[model samples]
Target: DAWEIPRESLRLEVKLGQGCFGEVWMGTWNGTTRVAIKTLKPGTMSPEAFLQEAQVMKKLRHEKLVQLYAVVSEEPIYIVIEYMSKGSLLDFLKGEMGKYLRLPQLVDMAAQIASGMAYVERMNYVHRDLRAANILVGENLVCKVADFGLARLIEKFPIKWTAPEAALYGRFTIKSDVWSFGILLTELTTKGRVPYPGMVNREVLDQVERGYRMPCPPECPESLHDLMCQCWRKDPEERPTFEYLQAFLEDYFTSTEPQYQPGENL
Candidate 1:
């Protein structure tokens, strides 16, 4: 079972950042530690959904997944998680971090994330908002998937980051989540460029609906981009499962060139 923290246990020090879901704060527990506290805004959606995040997170334990420390079930609910000092993977790809990373490190990070998502698949859950911004980084550049907002409800969605069917008809499936996973892989491969380039939400939807897809990212290998293309296939049935991705990534990290070489494709 998850720890049920009291409201007084958390001390909000400063605003760290905010996303479509809630305000995240850099705070402490018992006033002597560090934590990330996410407070759900009142009346945004049902507390049940917010509570649902706690449920999903506590049940999940992985090296590449964020750890939920505690939760306060009262009004203006607070979720306590271990602090991620490096922030999101997007920040790393944008700031002076590229100098610190090699393809080996990047491949390791991506494999960890793929491993985490495979666990999510085994659990029968889909992370609708799978993007670089939501992929948090901790010590040693360990990356973890965060902000499972789609665990319950969906509104104010990222149309550009969403799958075609989910964007068009609100059909959130594991396959649609695969599409978002591909978008995220593109972000990493492109060094954190905005997904879909200059296309607006409406334009992106239309373009995707008409069989259009983004081109291969510059500097990314053909095989890496090929995996992205597989994920973007119009038919969800054609998309690879999270477990399939895990297997492919496992092969890449173990004895292959991590898809940076054009000799093989997953």
Candidate 2:
């Protein structure tokens, strides 16, 4: 479980990012330890739900999942977690760094993220916002799933990343998370391209409801492309579970035989 930390231990140095409800900063802990400080704003947000999630998040310790080091629970409330130097995976893919990545690196990134999702899925938790922007990159180019349990952004589908069932009916479930995970895989393969191209959120809902799915990126493997399509199946029950996704991608990553030649049939 995470402990309550003295506010003095965290040094809020520079602002890192902001969301609809709160903002985050890159800071130093105990002068030497690096951390990301996520501050939650007052009002609008529910305190009971936040505390419940904070408790669960603290006990969830996984390599691919972001670690909650402590909580402030004072004034405006603070969440301290490991600092991800590379920032969001979306930014990493959109920047020059993505162009330099080899196929293996990208596969590893996808597999690592799935591994994290698998853990939470087995724990019976749902990460409603599992978009590329929420996945932070750390040392060794590791992919850690962030904002998994924060109620501040719970189940508020980010339009394009949302599953048809979740978007249309507000049915937020682990299967819905798997739907968003499929989008994450696509986002990686497409180098963080905008989902559904020029479609607005409302339009995306209509299209998805009309049986439309995002086209597979040319750079993604045929096997992965097929898997992603399954994930977006109109029926949530038909979507592959995170456990299956993690194993499939992991096996694909470690096999001596290649599924597709470096860039062939991608």
Candidate 3:
């Protein structure tokens, strides 16, 4: 079971948004710690399912993933999670602030998401919903993956983000997540432009079926574009793992690592 918080300790504030599961709010826990509260509408969804979601989240603790605090597992259920100040990555990229982001910072953002996904992959869990919208940014422009286990609720296929095999054969694996990560990188590189501009969902499916991959987002590094193409491979098994992707992005910066002279210590 996940940690249970007393309802009395929570002070609900303004509504954040109406989520797929229920209403979310900006709330204070113990009148001290700020948290994002997701309230479950009773009879609308099962308490057991909510509890299970909380349990699954509680086990996943990574700096790159949103931290699940505690659960109010009673009549009015509240799933408390880390409050991200910068909000969703999608909005951040689309806003004026996004306009000023340099290329290196953009690569850093991609590396952060890759780190989170690599951790998820390490745990043998697949983030079925991997996109800029599902990524939240906090202080220092840090990005964390969210809405992982809860993808079951709004289970609609995100054609733009969905891998070819997942859409064609209903086979969702870690590789599919890799494909989605590639699409997500495009989102980052393009400053939040919708994946495959001028293409609709049906068209996207058909085009990808015919070996169509999105061209390099303007100003995107050729190496990164190459990586994106590697992700969209026709064979899912050929895609790189999140670990490899994470390291690749990080190593892109490590090329400047300072070298030590031999016998310097002596």
Candidate 4:
């Protein structure tokens, strides 16, 4: 069984954001450790289904994925998770810290995300929602993918970031996730610019269906842009795997200044 903690032990503070189930809060455990607690709103979902799915999330342990600590499964259910001080990658990229990001740091962030997704892919799980907003940044700008295994509960389709086939057919496979990663790369390079800017969801969907991939961001390197194009291949089967992405990023990072401390630069 998943570890159960007493609800009284968690002291909820400010509201972080609204999660699929309900509100997520920045909380403290035993008045020492910082944690992110998700409160499940009554009547939004079945308790049995939520618990079953939560077990799956608990089993997915990886450095790049947000760690689930424990659950309060009784009335007023709460899910305690790892707290990332820097908050969402989306906000990080758009905030003051984003201004100091150099090429090495950007590539390193991409590599970290790729590494995490590689583990998820190997685990035979798909992160239906892969975006900058769903990635949380911890100490030293370390980014970890969050909100995995829960997108199915509230499939609020993010059309611009979604792959063509997924938008058209509700088919969300690993390939679709890869496609979303490409979009996420653009978001990273462009400092959190929304994909298909100046276009509505319908227009974006139609344009993508017609084989219109957005042009590379001005700051994005040509080679990285090429990799992005590969991720956006019309046939999902032709797209590179997360393993390939991780390897490419690792090689890219090393081929550049081998000893450059991205941490120092940032």
In model 3, which regions exceed 4 Å deviation?
Answer: 151-155, 253-266
Indicate which candidate wins on lDDT: 4
lDDT of each: 0.79, 0.80, 0.83, 0.84
lDDT of 2 at 151: 29
**Tens digits of lDDT, candidate 1, 159-220:** 88888788778788778888888898877766678988888988988889899988887666
Candidate 3 TM-score versus the reference: 0.90
- Of the pair 1 and 3, which is ahead by lDDT? 3
TM-score of 4: 0.90
Judged by lDDT against the true structure, how good is candidate 2?
0.80
How well does model 3 score by local distance difference test? 0.83
Candidate 3 colliding pairs: none
For model 4, how does the per-residue alpha-carbon lDDT over 1-266 read when each residue is reduced to its tens digit?
54899888889999978755788899899788999988889848787777765676777889999998888989787778999999999999999988788767788899999999998888877788899998999998899999764543212578887888887888887888899999999988888889888999989888888899988677556778898999999998999999999988878856644554444233
TM-score of 2: 0.89
Model 1, C-alpha of 27: deviation from truth (Å): 2.6
Better of 3 and 4 by lDDT: 4
Cα lDDT for residue 124, candidate 4: 75
| Count: clashes, candidate 1 | 0
RMSD of 3: 6.4
- Which candidate has the highest TM-score of all? 3
The per-residue C-alpha lDDT of model 3 at residue 166 equals 86
Give all TM-scores, in the order shown: 0.86, 0.89, 0.90, 0.90
